[PDB]
Chain length 46, copies 35
Amino acid sequence: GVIDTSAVESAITDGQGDMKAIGGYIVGALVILAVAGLIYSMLRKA
Amino acid sequence: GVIDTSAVESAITDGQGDMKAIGGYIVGALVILAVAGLIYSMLRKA
Amino acid sequence: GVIDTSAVESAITDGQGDMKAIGGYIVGALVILAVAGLIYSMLRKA
Amino acid sequence: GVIDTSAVESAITDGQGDMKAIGGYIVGALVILAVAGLIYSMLRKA
Amino acid sequence: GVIDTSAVESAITDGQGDMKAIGGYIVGALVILAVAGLIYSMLRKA
Amino acid sequence: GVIDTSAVESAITDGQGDMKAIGGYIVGALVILAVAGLIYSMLRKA
Amino acid sequence: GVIDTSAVESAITDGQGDMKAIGGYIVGALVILAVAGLIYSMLRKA
Amino acid sequence: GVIDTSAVESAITDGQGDMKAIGGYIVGALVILAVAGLIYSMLRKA
Amino acid sequence: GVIDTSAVESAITDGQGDMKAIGGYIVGALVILAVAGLIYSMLRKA
Amino acid sequence: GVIDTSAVESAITDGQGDMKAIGGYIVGALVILAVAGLIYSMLRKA
Amino acid sequence: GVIDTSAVESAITDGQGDMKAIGGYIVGALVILAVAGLIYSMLRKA
Amino acid sequence: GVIDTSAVESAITDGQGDMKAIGGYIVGALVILAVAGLIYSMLRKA
Amino acid sequence: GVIDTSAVESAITDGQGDMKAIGGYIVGALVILAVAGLIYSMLRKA
Amino acid sequence: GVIDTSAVESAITDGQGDMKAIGGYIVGALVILAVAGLIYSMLRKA
Amino acid sequence: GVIDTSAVESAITDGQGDMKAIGGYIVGALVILAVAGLIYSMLRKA
Amino acid sequence: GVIDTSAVESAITDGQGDMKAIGGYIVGALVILAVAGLIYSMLRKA
Amino acid sequence: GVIDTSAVESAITDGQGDMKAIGGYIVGALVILAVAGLIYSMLRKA
Amino acid sequence: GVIDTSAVESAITDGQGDMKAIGGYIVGALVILAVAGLIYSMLRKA
Amino acid sequence: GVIDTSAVESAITDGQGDMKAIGGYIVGALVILAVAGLIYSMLRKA
Amino acid sequence: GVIDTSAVESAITDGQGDMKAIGGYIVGALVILAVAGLIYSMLRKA
Amino acid sequence: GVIDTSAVESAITDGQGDMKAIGGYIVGALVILAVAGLIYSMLRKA
Amino acid sequence: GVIDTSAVESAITDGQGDMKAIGGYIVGALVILAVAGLIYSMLRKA
Amino acid sequence: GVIDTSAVESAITDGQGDMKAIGGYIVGALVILAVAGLIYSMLRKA
Amino acid sequence: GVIDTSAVESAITDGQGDMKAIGGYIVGALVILAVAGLIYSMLRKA
Amino acid sequence: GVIDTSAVESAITDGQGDMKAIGGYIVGALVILAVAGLIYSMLRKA
Amino acid sequence: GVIDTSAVESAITDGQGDMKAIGGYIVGALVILAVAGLIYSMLRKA
Amino acid sequence: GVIDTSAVESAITDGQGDMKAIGGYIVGALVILAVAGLIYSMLRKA
Amino acid sequence: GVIDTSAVESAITDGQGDMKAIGGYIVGALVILAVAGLIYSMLRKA
Amino acid sequence: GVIDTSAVESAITDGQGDMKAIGGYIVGALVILAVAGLIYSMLRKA
Amino acid sequence: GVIDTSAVESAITDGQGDMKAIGGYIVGALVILAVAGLIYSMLRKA
Amino acid sequence: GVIDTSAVESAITDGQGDMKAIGGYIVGALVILAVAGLIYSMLRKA
Amino acid sequence: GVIDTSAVESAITDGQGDMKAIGGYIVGALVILAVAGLIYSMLRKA
Amino acid sequence: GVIDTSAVESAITDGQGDMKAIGGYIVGALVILAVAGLIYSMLRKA
Amino acid sequence: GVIDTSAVESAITDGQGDMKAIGGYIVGALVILAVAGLIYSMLRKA
Amino acid sequence: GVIDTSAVESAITDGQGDMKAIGGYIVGALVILAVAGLIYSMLRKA
């Protein structure tokens, strides 16, 4: 019921927190990747 | 009987309340996820 | 006997009343659930 | 949840670390390539 | 992660090694070519 | 990688070998040409 | 009869109390589960 | 009843404890996986 | 419960161990591939 | 788990073996190609 | 794996065979060309 | 592969055939040219 | 039964409403993505 | 018995009515979903 | 006794009649359900 | 349902926002690339 | 979402920075090349 | 990104170094050529 | 039993009917998609 | 007892009959589905 | 008493007979079911 | 079932409609692209 | 569906707009290039 | 889209700017060359 | 019990029979698909 | 009592026998299935 | 079971039929494409 | 299945139609290009 | 498909239009060039 | 009564003992399963 | 109870044994698959 | 359990057998492809 | 399994057959192309 | 597969046909060019 | 293909037409030149 469903809101809140964080750090890797492929393209090219 | 069945309406009401709330916050996480995968796609891509 | 069995009809009547009512409100929750899972699917997806 | 999502940050961190490193060394090869093609161009030319 | 990404550095290292080597030997050919065209130019000329 | 890149050295080696050889024989023709034009010049002249 | 049926109200009261409590703590586990599956999804994904 | 329902809280507590722990270690594997696929992507790529 | 959840930690531990190992050896292949494509590029090129 | 993950190491090992081998023989073709284009260049030229 | 990778060696072998052959016959044409341009040069000249 | 590379030999063969032929007929023109310039030189001269 | 099944129609109606809406906004992102990749292609190209 | 079993037919009838109706409206959502994923695919693609 | 047991046959007969009838109409609903889930699957899918 | 689907609109909105932004900055790089290749072409050329 | 997409702007910014820089230094080589071919032209010429 | 792009500057630097050097030595040959044609002109002339 | 199972045949029949129909119309979209990607390929290409 | 148990055999017989029949017609739908997804795959693909 | 209890053995015997028989034929249906679900799985799948 | 499957036809119809439309407008861009690359080729060329 | 597919038309429209614009400005550069090479040709020539 | 495509116009603008500038300065060299060959012609001549 | 469990063996036997058969024919389609994609690749390619 | 409970052991024994047998043959089907899906995967793939 | 599995063979048969057919017609397009790119190459070239 | 696969033939037919048409008109441009480069060659030449 | 492929004809038409036009104006320059070299030849000569 | 209820505690104690034990060993299997699916995922993947 | 729960340990033990074994052999297939896709990639590539 | 899990080993064995075989024959095609693209490259080239 | 995997060998066999055939005929075109460019070179030249 | 690969032979056949034809007509132009340059040489000369 | 290759013949035809025409008019100039140099020779001479 109602109140208990307030706590649902809470844990779901943390959960959303984490998700956006980790999803964040993966993005870190992707950036390093993406960018390393930009350098690889620089060699290919020139 | 009838009246008692009015209270059934009531608790079922709270219950529906919670459900839509929590289902809500999970959606919070999913959004952070979804979106972090959009960034991951941004690296993959570029 | 007969008449008494008319009242049986009556209480069974209320009883059917309640049942369909509560069964109703549970459906309320289920809808909120169902629907929150539709949003969760929206994140999973996109 | 929250804290666990701090560690997500951490491994994603190493991951980004590696990525930028390897992406680095590939760039090493590309440079040697690129440059060897510059010499090949020097012969073609002259 | 981190360490594994140290080995990435290593193989990428050899890879750069080879590249600059082969790119080297191709240059050998190019030189012989280039130079044989210098002789051809010597006949054309004189 | 490294070793494989030793063989690169090898084939590039033969390749340089050929190049300087053929470039050689073309020079043979050029010499005969060059020289036949020297005779043509001898007639023009005298 | 009536009064005795007041105590029925009472024990049923505690009973409802417990139920909502335990049902609570199970939810604790489920959250840890749910959430650990969210991390597992994070690896699968990225 | 009430008290007994306090212990429900307790075991459900441990249970939540474990869940988040194991869910944890699975995440360990997933990370190693995820990350090994990042290296595989590094080869594919370069 | 708690303790049992310590063992969860343990097997999940081995599991993470393996994962990072195999993910490793696949990387071995990828490197040989990647690198063989670097040689193929060397021929294409020169 | 652990041991099984030792065998992962093993097959991944063979796999890396093959890869570097085949990638090798393709290089054979590329060399013949590359080199035949060097002769074609010799005609174009002279 | 290993053995299968022996056959890779084999087909790559034929492939290298062909390549050097065809690259050969093209060279035939180039020679006829090259040489016909040497005659054209003989007319231009004299 | 091998056999297919026998046909490469064949078409390259015709190709060389043509080349030497046409290169031939151009030489025809060049001769008429060359020679007409020899007559022009005869007038200039005398 | 029948009437209750009219309300099913109703909530399913809203549900369809939302779905098409959100599915909409995701499309917004996709467009921005798609289009940003069109610009990336413009650089690659020119 | 028989007649009463005629009414069984009747309520089961409404019930089938509802079912096909609601099942209907859910389909509404699914269509909006399905279709929104078709647009998402349109962005991914182009 | 015997005859009375003939009537047992009779009412049991009607009873079987009803049963198969109602069981019938429930099947009606189930079909509408089943089938609505087939459409839901059609959206999920496409 | 409906309202919740208004928020879907909202997050999808931000999401589209980001996408077009990042897709933007990648374009920044591409421009610098594109343009650096225009200079490289200027040297090649002259 | 929005903010995260501000950081996208940032890394894409550095990325553009690098690109224009490296693209720069390649231009350095090209200039030395270009110019060395201008000297080669000076000899050819005179 | 930025720093990595500092190293781009560096290798591009060496590269420019080499280029201007080799382009240099070719000029050496060209000078010897040019000049030998000046002597050839001296004979033609006188 | 038997007969009732004849009707099973019937509804399953319609069901198969629908399925092949809808599956049909989805194919309609896919064709328009597929084909629009063929045009996109036509631009990419030319 | 025995004989009555012969009739058990009989109704169970019809029952098996129906089951295999209906299970049949559902298969009809599944085939139409399956197959429509094969066409959808044909568009996706081409 | 004893003998009468021999007949108990007898009827219980038939009874066991029937039971295993009917239980048999139900199994017939279950098999047809089970198996029809295997086909349904075949469509789902493919 | 049947009729419902007529509507499947309908929405799938719109869906095909859209698809061919959007796929259309993307083609618009591609044409502008394609064509702008034709102009770029005109400069490269002349 | 249909309408949504009208907006597809719209964004694809802008997209085509941009494309033809940028493709335009690149053409600007190409013209300046092309033309600067015409001047370079003027020096070479005269 | 549209606006973003205004910036495309802008960078393409600078790009055209540079191009015409550099193409300019190369022309400077060409003029000095051209002209130095005019002096060389003056000596040859007189 | 035992014997009845012999028949279990039997039906399970047929069942395995079918499965491998159908799984077979699906493979038929897949082959035609697979192969048609090989032709599509042949066009893409050449 | 005791002895009778020895026979319990016996029938339970057969029962276990059957179970493991049938469970066996189902596994037969599953294998054929599993494996047919492996072939389907082979087509999908290649 | 067995027979039913004969029909599996049958539908899978048609399915394979279609697949190879459609896969066919796509090949038609690819050929027209492929070939139109051969003409485009003819213009590029000459 | 079969028939549906006849329509596959049909759309694939149109598709091939278009392809060869457009591929056609691109060829139109290429011809105008090709030919304009023939005129450019006429000026270069004379 | 067909009609859409009529528009392909149309844009390809304009495209051919432009091409022949621009290719035209370049020819304008070439003529002025060609001709200015004819005057330069007039001075050289006389 | 009381004491007897102490023994209830005792057997319930053993019972809890067993339960946690067996539940344990099942977990053993699940781990082997889980983990074997992790390897299967390793092949799928790589 | 306790002891019986020792045997639970035992069968669960075998069960874990099997699981890890079979999960093993499936891995065998996956390896052959994985690896055959590595060869397919070798052809695609070269 | 154990033994049954020996047979798991067996079928998984065949399965691995097939996989490596088919994966084999696909490689056959890929080789023919790969190689036909090598010839196509031979024409492109020469 | 094994045998089925013999047929895999078979279809893969045909597939390899086709591939080498078509790859063949494309080579036909390439030869005609290649060779027509040899004639174009003959005109350019002479 | 095999037969389909006979048609590959066929279209590749036409394709080779065209190629040699067009390559032909281009040669027509080249001849007119070549020859017009022979006349230009006649004026230059005399 | 074939027919399309008839049109290749056609445009190549016009192209040859033009070429011989323009090559013609250039010859006009050359004649005027040639001849004006004949007059210049007349003055030199006398």
